[PDB]
Amino acid sequence: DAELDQLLQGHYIKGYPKQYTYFLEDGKVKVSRPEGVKIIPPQSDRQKIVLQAHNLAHTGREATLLKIANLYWWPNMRKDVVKQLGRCQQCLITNASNKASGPILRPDRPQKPFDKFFIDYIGPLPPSQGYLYVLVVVDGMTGFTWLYPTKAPSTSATVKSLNVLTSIAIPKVIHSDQGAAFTSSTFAEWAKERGIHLEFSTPYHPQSSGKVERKNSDIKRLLTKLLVGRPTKWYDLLPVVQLALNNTYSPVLKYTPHQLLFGIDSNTPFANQDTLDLTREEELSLLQEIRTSLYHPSTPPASSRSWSPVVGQLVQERVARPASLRPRWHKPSTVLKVLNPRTVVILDHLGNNRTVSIDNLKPTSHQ
Amino acid sequence: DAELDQLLQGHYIKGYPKQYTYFLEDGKVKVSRPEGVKIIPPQSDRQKIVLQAHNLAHTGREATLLKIANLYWWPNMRKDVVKQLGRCQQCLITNASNKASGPILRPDRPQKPFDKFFIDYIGPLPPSQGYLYVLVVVDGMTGFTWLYPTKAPSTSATVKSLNVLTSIAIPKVIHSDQGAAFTSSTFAEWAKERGIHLEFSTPYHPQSSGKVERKNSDIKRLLTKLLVGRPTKWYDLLPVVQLALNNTYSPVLKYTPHQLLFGIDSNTPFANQDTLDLTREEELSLLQEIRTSLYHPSTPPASSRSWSPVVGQLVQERVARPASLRPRWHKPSTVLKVLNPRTVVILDHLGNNRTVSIDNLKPTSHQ
Amino acid sequence: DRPQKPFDKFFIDYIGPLPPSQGYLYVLVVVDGMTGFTWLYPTKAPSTSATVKSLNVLTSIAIPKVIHSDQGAAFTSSTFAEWAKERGIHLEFSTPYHPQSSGKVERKNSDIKRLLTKLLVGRPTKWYDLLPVVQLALNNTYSPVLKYTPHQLLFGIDSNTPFANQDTLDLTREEELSLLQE
Amino acid sequence: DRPQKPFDKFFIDYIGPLPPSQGYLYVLVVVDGMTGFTWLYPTKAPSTSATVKSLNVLTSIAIPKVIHSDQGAAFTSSTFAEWAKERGIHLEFSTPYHPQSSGKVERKNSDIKRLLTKLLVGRPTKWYDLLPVVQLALNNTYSPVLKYTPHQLLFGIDSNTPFANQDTLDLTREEELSLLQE
DNA sequence: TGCGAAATTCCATGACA
DNA sequence: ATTGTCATGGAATTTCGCA
DNA sequence: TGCGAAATTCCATGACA
DNA sequence: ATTGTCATGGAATTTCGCA
Ligand SMILES: Nc1c(C(=O)NCc2ccc(F)cc2F)c(=O)n(O)c2ncc(CCS(=O)(=O)CCN3CCOCC3)cc12
Ligand SMILES: Nc1c(C(=O)NCc2ccc(F)cc2F)c(=O)n(O)c2ncc(CCS(=O)(=O)CCN3CCOCC3)cc12
Ligand SMILES: [Mg+2]
Ligand SMILES: [Mg+2]
Ligand SMILES: [Mg+2]
Ligand SMILES: [Mg+2]
Ligand SMILES: [Mg+2]
Ligand SMILES: [Mg+2]
Ligand SMILES: [Zn+2]
Ligand SMILES: [Zn+2]
């Protein structure tokens, strides 16, 4: 009010250009601007005005200003608009992000077989012999896959299947998503008893299990082809599909998962006989160099408007199963530690420490 | 057999390079190639060999050849491999496509209000006052939207809601997806009785209704924000959201759907008063030029590996609701007519003429 | 002075009571003062409740600066005054027993009362289904003073349903006979 | 001549009958002739059915060129011959009453029969749960002739469970007493 | 005739079952 | 017989205020 | 030392709940 | 406290067969 009082008598105030005629009309300070005559409200009334214009339809920066600009003008209107956008809780948790995640990491292939297992469940499927799910275990180094039909994606069915598998070899690490079968205390006990470190994907991010997920696609794709025109009796086909995929060439690797695991084909059709004259010790020597020279992809180019996490940044976690007409994002939280450009720890919306993928995060807008 | 007989005695045969020693061993014609000694099977046995190697895991071109190359060699092996891939029905209907659709078309904005309505249903939603769905009617030219709560996405609820809406004006065209409420014979009769042409999107392609679909996002987004911390009682908010979105500025257009429809704001907050001194006839004259000078987007650049439909091409339609372990694509069909680079008519897998979007099509591989 | 514009003033009034049609007895008539555009809302009573319920539908499309009406009870109630104040709508009443509107609005309300009667005869209990087509006729009726229909004045375009062949708006000798009997 | 390789020859034989453990009585022993790698499959009978059911699990991982066994009924049946022919597996039998294997396989089968007995005492009906850990021990047992374990010869890597501290493989004086009583 | 800052425009991002 | 759309907020670009 | 064709490599596309 | 993956088939590139 006092600030606007000096403007009417011709005195200069920083932010208000001098080349405009500031007058009074109907008890309101006005100004003749090129767009027309606009009301200059006092400083004490500008927060409420921006709030009323925004609350009409909870619009963003430009759509809110265009409302205010129809009646009012003051120095740095968007600065006050953005100030309210960052304080509107409903917008922060409901609006979608407009910044893509950073480029994906391509973690190094495990150096040796049985260094890391990727396990996951497929299902539910059409009932076949009373079985509904399939436990899929993929060796990260070789891609060699084991298939186990189960009646439920349970810890008991996982333990019983992995006990049979671990008869051949014990893995260093078993990687899995955070499903109920793999996060149960019983499964952790089973792994500790055998000296196996349980590695868990960030929640709701199947990309992290992409090794076994991508194998799931080939399993279902092969099962689909073998079941064309037949009833979906997939139980008896699991051994067929397991053997077929384990002996299938990867065109980019030039080897099959069987070859990367054993260094020699078994009595399967079209078995490679290149190392027939070599000895087993010479074969394993050639196999060890093959396992090291395998092609490995690199991180792709970042998209032109990506964002990378910084310690202390306000980020919001995507809501897992958002109910109808409910916000898609949790309230803002702080980045505690940046494990890699794609994985961070945040102070959860419940107060806990949560390790999440940036794919399930957005940077809180307007700082 | 006779063809291979001349090769053993040193005679030249086209396709077999002369600089190799073709001999016989264990009753089989062999050749000493750089990769090793490979068996040259007779012409009469090569189709069965490619079939056995492919049928192992129904692999594509390179993964099938790498199997055959472990034992056999003959002129132009991939030519025989691709020949079988194009004749394997299970692969053609199960494999995913690797060619993206052509760039999207940006159809011209309707020149006048009520030239074309885009209608669609939102729901089901949490029960509010016994209502579960929302009929959304968007005027293509203005974006002006009408909201109608219904208990079901039915033809009767559509007719009752549009009878109230058509009290204000009758549209030339009503565009909708091929849902049950809009494809019923009763709805066609209702539109013919009022001289309204019913335009239908290609099936299972909500992009075609993108005008009203995109408005659905804003409706739910605003409903979500207004219901934060409250029970989802969205029935009484439909008039609020309708009025709020119809008076919301589009930052790229610089106008609200209300302004594009009426050329003047009503007694809503922050009403624009620029044309206050103009007459109504001068206002409508300014409105008619605004409706023509509106920004219109252009077709984006085609992706580096897109495909455009050609009359007579073998294409496959995506299966609508593919059951578990069932193919994702229908058997190959022929393109009858190319309506636009994104829409074609095909001879359906049932024998009918079907107008489909290329987003729900893939080109049959291997011609 | 500012030229008259749409949404500057809505003239509202009740027509009824009428023969029951699907449970409705009255018709709330809303006319824009500048364009002559007419909205028809069927109500069950000339009450503030029925008026708010129908004007809430209209005010979810466009809000007038001023609502004009006579001193009817439904419009002079404190509930309706609070309803108008909550939406920034100034209420404006004509003097009791001195109905004041405008020449355009007076003639528009005349056409409505006459057009309703012409279609009431023969089917006096089926007018609820006819309210949509009545609004189309009224809003596409050529205005001799402005040389534009209410539709053209409100939207700035021609209508997809022009009404060139209009009715007589007068009762034929047979419709006149089947009305005195009712 | 081609050097001996894994999957060139699988030696199979039945061990049993044993005390019942979760409904199983026999153990199908499969040993790779080159690496000495051992697979143990519990069966309910020394039948062709039980053999096919267990070898179907193994042949879904790797198929041998040759399967060697004695003239047992489960292996000389026409059903098992058709099963081997369908998978391209040549069957090879030792002369009746003249069991023929290999030095590595003979000693491997010796270790299996002895290692089974050492853990049968005290818990004769709980060996089904121990078959996984028995295979790990057998397949990570250092071979003096080849100076590599079966795991290393099959996979070309060291195992994450090396077995340096191995058992005595001989019955202690107390285990010997609690066995004659059984 | 050019500077710094504010204002405007640009546009990749994502979600409409 | 038909076809994506557009609010969003940092960034890029233009315009403004002043000299 | 270079040509045409075959062979190989490249890699955008899409789907794994 | 953790991280995408890879079969696929036209296209781009390289290699082969021959001179
Ligand atoms: N969605 C799943 C997909 C999937 O979509 N694949 C599709 C897919 C998409 C993109 C991609 F690149 C790969 C991919 F496979 C999946 O594959 N698999 O295997 C899953 N497996 C378990 C669960 C339940 C997770 S859960 O509900 O149990 C979490 C409980 N708690 C976690 C900790 O926080 C509290 C809650 C989901 C999925
Ligand atoms: N999936 C729907 C979405 C949707 O996903 N939106 C999400 C979406 C995704 C991408 C996009 F860019 C926009 C978009 F809105 C939808 O919005 N709306 O509105 C729908 N409306 C009806 C039906 C049923 C169609 S159906 O089953 O009735 C077909 C019956 N017959 C047709 C003829 O052939 C025989 C079968 C589905 C949807
Ligand atoms: Mg999972
Ligand atoms: Mg999965
Ligand atoms: Mg729909
Ligand atoms: Mg929709
Ligand atoms: Mg009255
Ligand atoms: Mg025997
Ligand atoms: Zn908001
Ligand atoms: Zn196939």
Author numbering:
A (entry chain A), B (entry chain A): 9 to 375
C (entry chain B), D (entry chain B): 116 to 297
Paper text:
INSTIs selectively block the strand transfer (ST) reaction, which is the second step catalyzed by the viral enzyme integrase (IN) (after 3′-processing). INSTIs specifically bind at the active site of IN when it is engaged with a viral DNA end. The generalized INSTI pharmacophore comprises two key elements: a metal chelating scaffold, optimized to bind a pair of Mg2+ ions in the IN active site, and a halobenzyl side chain, connected to the core by a flexible linker, which binds to viral DNA. Previous X-ray crystal structures of our INSTIs bound to the active site of the prototype foamy virus (PFV) IN in a complex with viral DNA (intasome) were instrumental in guiding our design and development of compounds that are broadly effective against IN mutants. However, recent cryo-EM structures of compounds 4c, 4d, and 4f bound to HIV-1 intasomes revealed crucial differences in the binding of these compounds to the IN active sites in PFV and HIV-1 intasomes.
Compound 6u has a methylsulfonyl-containing substituent at the 6-position; 6v has an extended morpholinoethylsulfonyl group, which we designed to mimic the MES (morpholinoethylsulfonic acid) buffer molecule in our PFV IN cocrystal structures, and 6w, which has the same 6-tethered phenylsulfonyl-containing substituent as 4f. Substituting the phenyl group of 4f with a more extended and bulkier morpholinoethylsulfonyl group (6v) caused a dramatic loss in potency against WT HIV-1 (267.9 ± 68.8 nM). Based on the crystal structure of 6v bound to the PFV intasome and the cryo-EM structure of 4f bound to the HIV-1 intasome, it is clear that the binding modes of compounds 6v and 4f are very similar. Therefore, the differences in potency are largely due to the differences in the 6-substituents and specifically the morpholine ring of 6v (which is extended by two additional carbons from the sulfonyl group) and the phenyl ring of 4f. The sulfonyl group of 6v, like the modification on 4f, was intended to mimic the binding position of the molecule MES in the active site of the intasome; however, in the compound, it is in an inverted conformation relative to the binding of MES. When superimposed with the apo model, the bound MES group of 6v would clash with several water molecules (red dashed circles), suggesting that the binding of this compound might displace bound water molecules and potentially cause further structural rearrangements in this region. The more extended moiety on 6v would be expected to displace at least one additional water molecule and could displace as many as nine water molecules in total (red circles).
